[PDB]
Design an enzyme around this catalytic site. Structure first.
Site, PDB file in Angstrom:
ATOM      1  N   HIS A  61       0.776  -1.145   0.094  1.00 57.29           N
ATOM      2  CA  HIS A  61       0.200   0.067  -0.126  1.00 57.29           C
ATOM      3  C   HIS A  61       0.917   1.403  -0.155  1.00 57.29           C
ATOM      4  O   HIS A  61       0.295   2.302  -0.332  1.00 57.29           O
ATOM      5  CB  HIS A  61      -1.106   0.118   0.969  1.00 57.29           C
ATOM      6  CG  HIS A  61      -1.713  -1.263   1.540  1.00 57.29           C
ATOM      7  ND1 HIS A  61      -2.771  -1.646   0.723  1.00 57.29           N
ATOM      8  CD2 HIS A  61      -1.395  -2.508   2.248  1.00 57.29           C
ATOM      9  CE1 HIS A  61      -3.081  -2.978   1.337  1.00 57.29           C
ATOM     10  NE2 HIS A  61      -2.335  -3.310   2.123  1.00 57.29           N
ATOM     11  N   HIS A  91       6.121   6.910   5.627  1.00 56.97           N
ATOM     12  CA  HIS A  91       5.909   6.252   4.476  1.00 56.97           C
ATOM     13  C   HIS A  91       5.325   7.641   3.860  1.00 56.97           C
ATOM     14  O   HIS A  91       5.313   8.546   4.494  1.00 56.97           O
ATOM     15  CB  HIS A  91       4.852   5.431   4.589  1.00 56.97           C
ATOM     16  CG  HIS A  91       3.598   5.755   4.993  1.00 56.97           C
ATOM     17  ND1 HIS A  91       3.615   5.913   6.702  1.00 56.97           N
ATOM     18  CD2 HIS A  91       2.779   6.375   4.870  1.00 56.97           C
ATOM     19  CE1 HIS A  91       2.625   6.439   6.913  1.00 56.97           C
ATOM     20  NE2 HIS A  91       1.814   6.490   6.030  1.00 56.97           N
ATOM     21  N   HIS A  93       2.076   8.883   0.566  1.00 51.53           N
ATOM     22  CA  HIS A  93       0.916   8.830  -0.178  1.00 51.53           C
ATOM     23  C   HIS A  93       1.013   9.634  -1.349  1.00 51.53           C
ATOM     24  O   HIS A  93       1.460  10.946  -1.164  1.00 51.53           O
ATOM     25  CB  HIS A  93      -0.201   9.091   0.639  1.00 51.53           C
ATOM     26  CG  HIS A  93      -0.568   8.274   1.874  1.00 51.53           C
ATOM     27  ND1 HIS A  93      -1.306   6.964   1.792  1.00 51.53           N
ATOM     28  CD2 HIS A  93      -0.034   8.412   3.335  1.00 51.53           C
ATOM     29  CE1 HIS A  93      -1.234   6.763   3.207  1.00 51.53           C
ATOM     30  NE2 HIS A  93      -0.397   7.351   3.727  1.00 51.53           N
ATOM     31  N   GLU A 103      -3.509  13.340   1.193  1.00 56.16           N
ATOM     32  CA  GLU A 103      -4.587  12.864   2.098  1.00 56.16           C
ATOM     33  C   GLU A 103      -5.509  14.024   2.665  1.00 56.16           C
ATOM     34  O   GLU A 103      -6.542  14.039   2.164  1.00 56.16           O
ATOM     35  CB  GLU A 103      -4.124  11.734   3.076  1.00 56.16           C
ATOM     36  CG  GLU A 103      -3.377  10.616   2.455  1.00 56.16           C
ATOM     37  CD  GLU A 103      -3.334   9.245   3.240  1.00 56.16           C
ATOM     38  OE1 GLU A 103      -4.113   8.389   2.535  1.00 56.16           O
ATOM     39  OE2 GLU A 103      -3.199   9.403   4.433  1.00 56.16           O
ATOM     40  N   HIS A 116       4.000  10.881   5.954  1.00 58.06           N
ATOM     41  CA  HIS A 116       3.621  10.850   7.140  1.00 58.06           C
ATOM     42  C   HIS A 116       4.781  10.421   7.930  1.00 58.06           C
ATOM     43  O   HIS A 116       5.313   9.264   7.618  1.00 58.06           O
ATOM     44  CB  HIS A 116       2.690   9.695   7.325  1.00 58.06           C
ATOM     45  CG  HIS A 116       1.288  10.416   6.579  1.00 58.06           C
ATOM     46  ND1 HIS A 116       1.025  11.577   6.453  1.00 58.06           N
ATOM     47  CD2 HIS A 116       0.024   9.597   6.132  1.00 58.06           C
ATOM     48  CE1 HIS A 116      -0.194  11.878   5.806  1.00 58.06           C
ATOM     49  NE2 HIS A 116      -0.888  10.731   5.633  1.00 58.06           N
ATOM     50  N   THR A 195      -5.116   6.441   8.710  1.00 61.81           N
ATOM     51  CA  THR A 195      -5.761   6.564   7.510  1.00 61.81           C
ATOM     52  C   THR A 195      -5.671   5.440   6.576  1.00 61.81           C
ATOM     53  O   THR A 195      -6.057   5.379   5.340  1.00 61.81           O
ATOM     54  CB  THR A 195      -5.090   7.752   6.689  1.00 61.81           C
ATOM     55  OG1 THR A 195      -3.709   7.519   5.830  1.00 61.81           O
ATOM     56  CG2 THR A 195      -4.957   9.187   7.216  1.00 61.81           C
TER      57      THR A 195
HETATM   58  C1  LIG Z   1       0.344   1.642  14.122  1.00 67.70           C
HETATM   59  C2  LIG Z   1       1.197   0.469  13.307  1.00 67.70           C
HETATM   60  C3  LIG Z   1       2.063   0.820  12.210  1.00 67.70           C
HETATM   61  C4  LIG Z   1       1.677   2.227  11.436  1.00 67.70           C
HETATM   62  O1  LIG Z   1       2.042   3.030  11.182  1.00 67.70           O
HETATM   63  N1  LIG Z   1       0.125   2.023  10.995  1.00 67.70           N
HETATM   64  C5  LIG Z   1      -0.362   3.042  10.002  1.00 67.70           C
HETATM   65  N2  LIG Z   1      -1.564   3.197   9.609  1.00 67.70           N
HETATM   66  N3  LIG Z   1      -1.881   4.183   8.812  1.00 67.70           N
HETATM   67  C6  LIG Z   1      -0.822   5.123   9.263  1.00 67.70           C
HETATM   68  S1  LIG Z   1      -1.215   6.924   8.579  1.00 67.70           S
HETATM   69  N4  LIG Z   1      -1.321   6.659   6.873  1.00 67.70           N
HETATM   70  O2  LIG Z   1      -2.167   7.494   9.236  1.00 67.70           O
HETATM   71  O3  LIG Z   1       0.213   7.558   8.749  1.00 67.70           O
HETATM   72  S2  LIG Z   1       0.059   4.717  10.276  1.00 67.70           S
HETATM   73 ZN   LIG Z   2       0.177   7.770   5.951  1.00 66.72          ZN
END
Ligand SMILES: CCCC(=O)Nc1nnc(S(N)(=O)=O)s1
Ligand SMILES: [Zn+2]
Ligand SMILES: CCCC(=O)Nc1nnc(S(N)(=O)=O)s1
EC number: 4.2.1.1
Length: 257
Positions: A61, A91, A93, A103, A116, A195
């Protein structure tokens, strides 16, 4: 399984993650004229001097760079936060074209990508426990626009050919995430969620006002990644963003006037 396609994308996620229609979902549109300056907001404290990056991974993803979070090495504190949040991973998006990919949006404006930096609250001991808490995570969101190159991003972009497909990872040591930050730490903040599934409502969002500029060549390398595993029909990893969700009973606060 969930993804960003027609048949498994964000509009489908609620069926497996019913919290998708919850009261504090992310991302949101940041209406800059409705966000209120909060003078009680402290400056953000970003202490990344001792960050230890470990691996870079294509998880099907996004791609993520993981850090050693077994110690207070790269921590986020201050701003709206109480306590210390350890950097776990960053990471991105991004879109199929430069006009989409972020996002969060700013006055409905979509950026080409959104970085993020995910941190978890050390009072909860580990990230799995922190995801179960309303103040368990702090994600620092940084917008990417396309223009000049971001030199601090180049070492990331250059390794993406080695993690083209879902499940590939590679050693990624000595990466300094301070090279991904804009000049200003002015931010908006609001209570939100992850997200991506499980969409847990555990995130204090800190979204920086100032975007970073990345080059078309840099973002084009993001778009060469694959959602699919090797040996599967090639599906370019693009448009891995969830759209803005209803703000509901929430106020976005600005750290700046
Ligand atoms: C919480 C465990 C590992 C992790 O980081 N999971 C995430 N799932 N969505 C994220 S986002 N797009 O809000 O930054 S991070
Ligand atoms: Zn993210
Ligand atoms: C405060 C952390 C937990 C949270 O905020 N939200 C969720 N609890 N179960 C969820 S499911 N099965 O929809 O993904 S989400």
């Amino acid at each position: 399984h969930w993804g960003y396609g027609k048949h498994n994308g964000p509009e489908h996620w609620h069926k497996d993650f019913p919290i998708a229609k919850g009261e504090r979902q992310s991302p949101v549109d940041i209406d800059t004229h409705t966000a209120k300056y909060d003078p009680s907001l402290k400056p953000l404290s970003v202490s990344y001097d001792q960050a230890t990056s470990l691996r870079i991974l294509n998880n099907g993803h996004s791609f993520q760079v993981t850090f050693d979070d077994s110690q207070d090495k790269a921590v986020l504190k201050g701003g709206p936060l109480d306590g210390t949040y350890r950097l776990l991973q960053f990471h991105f998006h991004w879109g199929s074209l430069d006009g989409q990919g972020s996002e969060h949006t700013v006055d409905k404006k979509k950026y080409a990508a959104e970085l993020h930096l995910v941190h978890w609250n050390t009072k909860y001991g580990d990230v799995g426990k922190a995801v179960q808490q309303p103040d368990g995570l702090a994600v620092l969101g940084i917008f990417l626009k396309v223009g000049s190159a971001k030199p601090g991003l180049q070492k990331v972009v250059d390794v993406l050919d080695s993690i083209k497909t879902e499940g590939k990872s590679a050693d990624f040591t000595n990466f300094d995430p301070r090279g991904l930050l804009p000049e200003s730490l002015d931010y908006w903040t609001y209570p939100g969620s992850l997200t991506t599934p499980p969409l847990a409502e555990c995130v204090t969002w800190i979204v920086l006002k100032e975007p970073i500029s990345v080059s078309s060549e840099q973002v084009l390398k993001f778009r060469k990644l694959n959602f699919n595993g090797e040996g599967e029909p090639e599906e370019l990893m693009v448009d891995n963003w969830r759209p803005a969700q209803p703000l509901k009973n929430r106020q976005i606060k600005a750290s700046f006037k």
